[PDB]
Structures are given as structure tokens and as C-alpha cells.
Amino acid sequence: GTRVFKKASPNGKLTVYLGKRDFVDHIDLVEPVDGVVLVDPEYLKERRVYVTLTCAFRYGREDLDVLGLTFRKDLFVANVQSFPPAPEDKKPLTRLQERLIKKLGEHAYPFTFEIPPNLPCSVTLQPGPEDTGKACGVDYEVKAFCAENLEEKIHKRNSVRLVIRKVQYAPERPGPQPTAETTRQFLMSDKPLHLEASLDKEIYYHGEPISVNVHVTNNTNKTVKKIKISVRQYADICLFNTAQYKCPVAMEEADDTVAPSSTFCKVYTLTPFLANNREKRGLALDGKLKHEDTNLASSTLLREGANREILGIIVSYKVKVKLVVSRGSDVAVELPFTLMHPKPKDDDIVFEDFAR
Secondary structure, eight states, rough: OOOEEEOOOOOSSSEEEEEOSEEOOSSOOOOEEEEEEOHHHHTTTOEEEEEEEEEEEEEETTTTTOOTTTTTEEEEEEEEEESSSSSSSOOOOHHHHHHHHHOOOEEEEEEEEEOOOTTTTEEEEEGGGGGGOEEEEEEEEEEEEESOOOOOOOOOGEEEEEEEEEEEOOOOOOSOOOOEEEEEEHHHHSSSSSEEEEEESSETTOOEEEEEEEEEOSSSSSEEEEEEEEEEEEEOOOOSOOEEEEEEEEEEEEEEOOOTEEEEEEEEEEOOOGGGGTSSSSSEEEEOOOSTOBBBBBOOOOOOOSSSGGGGGEEEEEEOOOOOOOOOEEEEEEEEEEEEOOOOOOOOOOEOOOOO
């Protein structure tokens, strides 16, 4: 069938319908935000119905939104007048908007938004109970409201707000293997311990295993007593309160040894996922911890020569490989990778509440 999310205003006069909650950014373009708003003329009359799409960065207690306490910076705002229509936007109606207007009445008006690709994806930094005031993130909001003009105050019984998400996808690049990272260290020795590691891919999706090929050429007389393989998330806050967070999101400690004067090679596999990091603090996520469709945040795509500050939060991931040498130092390398949201993958309509 065909699911349609909907949400009515408090007073029940205004209703918004959307074909989905998450819109995929394909780097070059973002899936269109195509919806419909069911209106009530007798109720409005002179009041027009507007629909606004806002991408904003927020900093402060997440439960609050009060001037003087919470910080907010709009990154993009688009408003359309859905009622009465007018070439506000040449409406090449989407099939869904067509079927929806059919399903609803003569009071169903379409609204459509095209989200610019250079904008940051939805992201939420969970700071921890002791630092709840350092919470922040990037959110997208669709707001339909009844008003005489975009100059006067919006009434909450007169409006409806839906928080949609923009999530990031990128296909795997058919080409060369990722470059290996290496390090050569002398451990009170004439010859070095050479550590080399590489990942099986450049791009991984949420839930996908990551295989790390570890190769050690131990030309010293010391012994590696154990190998620690981890995935680390780095999250830099770039607006309002500059800061950098780092958090392991997967870890595997292997009591594998590398004897003096020998070579060792092994593939380790780990999967980072939120499910095992719920208690972690200072972690970037792609939605609110409470929602079931939330994952670790995706890697921020930084296009060449882009203002990185207006992205709000920059998220990156590395795999770390560390050799613990026995005290008869430690040797480590880090490997960058890109974490993406998985690929998306005319039957009668079915409504469902938007509320996640």
C-alpha cells in the first residue's frame, strides 16, 4: 500500500500530509519535500495558509525554546503560499499530491520545497545529563499556519509543525581499494616495528560490518601482547560554542600476540552502532535518542571550498588500530572512512500519525 503521514493542528482546522519523514540527500540533489495541506475556508476567509520549511541550528536545553536561554540560527528558510494558490510555485504536482487532492477535497492545496544540497543533514548532539545545556543540533521543520501575511504572529492552535529529517546517502565508488595507513616505530631497537592497516571499503552504511586488515612486521625483540581495534566518532561544534567531542563507538580487544622478529596478519571485524552506545555522552546522532529510527550521525560531506562553520556540527569517523607492546610504548594508526545512511530501497492510501 501507500503510507501517508499526517498531522492536524491543535484546533483541528489545519492538516498536513507528507509521503515520508526522512528525505534523502543524494549529494547532487535532495528528494523534494512534496506535501498537501487540508484547509477550512469557512474558518479562515481572509487568512491565507502558508507553509514554511526551516533548517536551523539550535544550542541549549533541548526542551526549551526561550529567547535569552536558547540559541537558534536559521540556516535556510523557504515559505510558500498554498492557499490561495497562485503561481507561488509552478506546481508540477507529484503523483502523491495528485492522489491526495483526489482523496481529500477541494480544500486540499499542495506545497512543495526543494532543499538546497549544501545544507547540513539532521544531527543531534547528546551532551549528557550533567551538561544538558550544551545540547545542540541541526533540525528541519515543516510548519503550516493560517495568517493574513508573513508579518503577523502565528497562533499555535492555528498551526502545525512536523520535524522532518534530511539524511545523507552516497553510493560505493567502484574503484581502487582504500589506501593503507602505516607507521614505523623503534622500541629501544635497531630495526622498527612496522604496523600497516587498511579498510575493505571507503563507504559504510549504518549497521554494516567494517573489516580491518592488520599487518605487523615486528623487526624488534619486543612482543606485542594485544591488539585493540576501535571505531571513533569525532564531532566538532562550529557555532555558538566551539568545541570538539570524541567517543569510541565500537571496540574489540584481541589478545593476539606478535612475537619478536616475525610477521603477523589478521582481519578483524567490528560494527559500530548506537544500540551499544546509548549511555555514551557527547555523541552525534542523526535524530533524537528516543526515536527508533535514530542512528549514529552520518559523516559530514565537506564539498571543496565550502563554509564549514554554517554546517553547525562536523561529524567524522576513524578506525584506530593500536598494538600494546609488553614492557619487557604503543603503536597505532588511524583509518578514515565515511558512514552513510542506507539507500532508500499507486496502491490505495493509508494514513498514519507523523509523530515518530
